[PDB]
Design an enzyme around this catalytic site. Structure first.
Site, mmCIF file in Angstrom:
data_model
loop_
_atom_site.group_PDB
_atom_site.id
_atom_site.type_symbol
_atom_site.label_atom_id
_atom_site.label_comp_id
_atom_site.label_asym_id
_atom_site.label_seq_id
_atom_site.Cartn_x
_atom_site.Cartn_y
_atom_site.Cartn_z
ATOM 1 N N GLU A 1 42.246 33.477 47.166
ATOM 2 C CA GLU A 1 41.524 34.580 46.555
ATOM 3 C C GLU A 1 40.633 35.258 47.584
ATOM 4 O OE1 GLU A 1 38.935 33.140 43.516
ATOM 5 O OE2 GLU A 1 38.282 31.446 44.751
ATOM 6 N N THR A 2 40.308 36.515 47.295
ATOM 7 C CA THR A 2 39.508 37.327 48.197
ATOM 8 C C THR A 2 38.029 37.052 47.987
ATOM 9 O OG1 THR A 2 39.515 39.143 46.601
ATOM 10 C CG2 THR A 2 41.238 39.145 48.294
ATOM 11 N N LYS A 3 37.280 37.030 49.084
ATOM 12 C CA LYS A 3 35.850 36.779 49.013
ATOM 13 C C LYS A 3 35.126 38.057 48.621
ATOM 14 C CE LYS A 3 32.759 33.764 51.552
ATOM 15 N NZ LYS A 3 31.360 33.831 52.054
ATOM 16 N N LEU A 4 34.247 37.949 47.632
ATOM 17 C CA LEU A 4 33.529 39.091 47.087
ATOM 18 C C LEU A 4 32.086 39.051 47.564
ATOM 19 C CD1 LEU A 4 36.073 39.499 45.750
ATOM 20 C CD2 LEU A 4 35.000 39.272 43.523
ATOM 21 N N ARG B 1 25.691 37.024 42.690
ATOM 22 C CA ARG B 1 26.370 36.077 41.820
ATOM 23 C C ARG B 1 25.699 36.103 40.458
ATOM 24 N NH1 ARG B 1 29.596 30.548 43.085
ATOM 25 N NH2 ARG B 1 30.481 30.454 40.977
#
Ligand SMILES: Nc1ncnc2c1ncn2[C@@H]1O[C@H](COP(=O)(O)O)[C@@H](O)[C@H]1O
Length: 152
Positions: free
Chosen positions: A121-124, A128
DNA sequence: AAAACTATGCATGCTCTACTGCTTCTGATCTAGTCGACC
């Protein structure tokens, strides 16, 4: 006095903050004022871990604090040391400490996943947040348990 | 013809009302710094 000072800072009033601090100064000793300054700065440097304090307070307090994130409920429910909690799990309208991720070495990544398929998955990049929805009642909580519901 | 009473103009003092200059209070603006929380 601390509640008055905090609310009054939130209310954009300084004369009342000065009055409260003056009362605290006039009704305290040097050591008490030093400790009060430390609490205001939010650092005590007691040298004892928070985990140790929670463990001495009750057998199962770190888990409850992680699930709830409010010193009121932990202090209230866990009063008699003998009486414990049967099951502690995430509850509505109570912040829960988020689960983070650790550094990983690309070389042994498969080993870290027990030689099984995994998700990439891509880091956002950003805040948070966690959202609690019950009907049209919405609550938003940040990484550490601060309430950002007013903004969103 | 002389003396006494009264009228009017001007001098003097006092008090009251505009106008200019100095000092001090208030408001508005800018610039610099502080605090919150996260990553
Ligand atoms: N897709 C995601 N799922 C869960 N946590 C995330 C995700 N993307 C970013 N994060 C958060 O970002 C942290 C790492 O920082 P990085 O992003 O600069 C993680 O420990 C998580 O708290």
């Amino acid at each position: 006095l601390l509640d008055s000072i905090a609310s009054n800072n939130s209310a954009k009033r300084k004369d009342l903050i000065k009055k409260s601090l003056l009362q605290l100064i006039t009704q305290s000793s040097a050591l008490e004022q030093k400790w009060l300054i430390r609490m205001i700065i939010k650092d005590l440097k007691l040298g004892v871990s928070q985990q140790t304090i929670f463990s001495v307070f009750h057998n199962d307090a770190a888990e409850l604090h992680n699930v709830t994130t409010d010193l009121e409920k932990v202090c209230r429910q866990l009063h008699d040391p003998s009486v414990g909690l049967s099951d502690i799990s995430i509850t509505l309208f109570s912040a829960f400490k988020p689960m983070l991720a650790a550094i990983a070495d690309i070389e042994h990544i498969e080993k870290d996943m027990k030689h099984q398929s995994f998700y990439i998955e891509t880091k956002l990049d950003g805040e948070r947040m966690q959202m609690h929805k019950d009907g049209d009642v919405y609550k938003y909580f940040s990484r550490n348990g601060y309430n950002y519901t007013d903004q969103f």
